[PDB]
């Protein structure tokens, strides 16, 4: 806190330690790599007890992945209005991609093409996980995936 | 690091350790409250890193801030009353308590900027930062900052 509006604005200029920032949730629900061509899951992890729920959970991820890939591909051919909440152009080692965000019912999702590839990296989180954090997260995580830059399904 | 793609994905599920996330830039260049009607600056602060705090410099930088505030307000206004023709890089509807607003981000030459209407008011909160200040961080920051400005919710000019 501060005395007045001027002092508040001066305080906003100080270095913003993401340290002092509390989040309701900062963990993902699910994370996967899917094809940019058809939204098929090539690899996934989830946080979310029995056999049918393991099966069901993969089925639900497949449906979600398909929906998200459709919105991503529509947004990429920018001849219509954007489904996405955000489109941030980014560079990892001079490889370019774009970070999109999609609301899916109560969930926050974030997706980016692995640069030059036929693959998307997709994060799925509860609605309490801020989009700003997802965007930071996905850009950093993408740096780990240089092996897959340019990956072609062929 | 990790062993394979599966392990990489599993690692992304863990609580995002903020204590490890380094940024090139996490300080704003400038911060202001401007009118949603005309983009007129009502209060501002700017960092003193470039030139000495003197006279000509002060006059010049305020003039620049006024020009930028106007351009950004115009972009915001246009975005607020349409669907498909968005200038902004993002638009996040947020709720503070039961009040609603929207966080917009704009590329301004090499600068990253972030703006949100102070809920139910004639005022906008505007952040200006260098291009190395990630938009995701600006969005987090302005939502949190907006929580401190309840005194100004419902503020009307006149």
Strands B30-35 and B41-46 turn out to be antiparallel
Residue A141, C-beta contacts closer than 8 angstroms, at least 6 positions apart: A121, B8, B12
What residues of A are in contact with residue B23 (Cβ under 8 Å)?
Answer: 18
Report helix, strand and coil shares of chain A as percent, to nearest 5. 35, 30, 35
- Positions of E strands within chain B: 30-35, 41-46, 90-96, 99-108, 111-117, 123-130
Could you tell me which CATH number the domain at A27-154 has? 3.30.450.30
CA of B30: how far to CAs of A24, B11, B53, B113, in Å? 29, 36, 15, 10
Strands A41-46 and B41-46 turn out to be unpaired
Tokens of B111: 């600068």
The nearest CA of chain A is from the CA of B86 a distance in Å of 9
Strands A107-113 and A41-46 turn out to be unpaired
Structural element, H or E, at residue B140: helix B135-146
Alpha helices (H) along B44-103: 55-80
Distance CA A118, CA A149 (A): 9
Helix A131-142 × helix B135-146 angle, to 10° = 160
State which residue of chain B sits closest to A145, comparing Cα positions.
B5
Q: Could you identify the residue written with the tokens 């089925």?
A: A59
- Resolution (angstroms) equals 2.1
Chain A, 11-50: which have a CB under 8 Å from a chain B CB?
A: 12-19, 21, 26-28, 30-33, 42-47
Give yes or no for A58 touching B (CB within 8 A). Answer: no
Tally of residues, chain A: 154
Closest to B128 (Cα-Cα) out of B13, B7, B29, B18: B29
Distance CA A11, CA A9 (A): 5
Closest to B95 (Cα-Cα) out of B48, B143, B152, B49: B143
| Residue B60 exposed, middle or buried by CB count within 10 Å (0-12, 13-18, 19+) | exposed
Sheet holding A41-46, edge to edge: A41-46, A30-35, A119-125, A107-113, A95-104, A86-92, B90-96, B99-108, B111-117, B123-130, B30-35, B41-46
Hey, how many other C-beta atoms are within 10 angstroms of the C-beta on A148? 19
Distance CA B130, CA B57 (A): 19
The string over B114-149, giving b where at least 16 C-beta atoms fall within 10 Å of a residue's C-beta and e elsewhere, is: bbbbbbebbbbbbbbbeeebbbbbbbbbbbbbbeeb
CA atoms within 13 A on the CB side of A73: 14
Q: Could you identify the residue written with the tokens 């703006």?
A: B115
Distance CA B90, CA B92 (A): 7
Q: What is chain A's Cα-based Rg?
A: 18
Q: Do B92 and A86 touch (CB under 8 A)?
A: yes
Distance CA A127, CA A123 (A): 12
Give yes or no for B143 touching A (CB within 8 A). Answer: yes
Could you tell me which CATH number the domain at B27-158 has? 3.30.450.30
Q: Best interface-test mutation with A: which of B2, B9, B32 has the largest number of A CBs within 10 A?
A: B9
Contact B134, B100 (CB under 8 A): no
Contact B117, B123 (CB under 8 A): yes
Tokens of A90: 């980014």
| Residue B93 exposed, middle or buried by CB count within 10 Å (0-12, 13-18, 19+) | exposed
């Amino acid at each position: 806190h501060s005395k007045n509006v001027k002092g508040f604005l001066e305080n906003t200029l100080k270095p913003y330690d993401l340290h002092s920032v509390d989040f309701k949730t900062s963990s993902l629900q699910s994370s996967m790599i899917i094809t940019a061509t058809n939204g098929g899951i090539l690899s996934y992890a989830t946080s979310n007890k029995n056999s049918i729920n393991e099966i069901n959970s993969v089925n639900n991820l497949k449906m979600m992945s398909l929906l998200i890939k459709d919105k991503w591909s529509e947004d990429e051919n920018d001849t219509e209005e954007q489904h996405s909440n955000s489109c941030y152009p980014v560079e990892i080692d001079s490889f370019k991609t774009k970070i999109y965000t999609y609301e899916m019912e109560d969930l926050h999702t974030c997706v980016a093409q692995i640069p030059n590839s036929d693959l998307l990296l997709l994060f799925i989180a509860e609605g309490s996980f801020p989009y700003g954090l997802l965007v930071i997260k996905i850009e950093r995580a993408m740096r780990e995936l240089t092996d897959l830059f340019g990956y072609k399904l062929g």
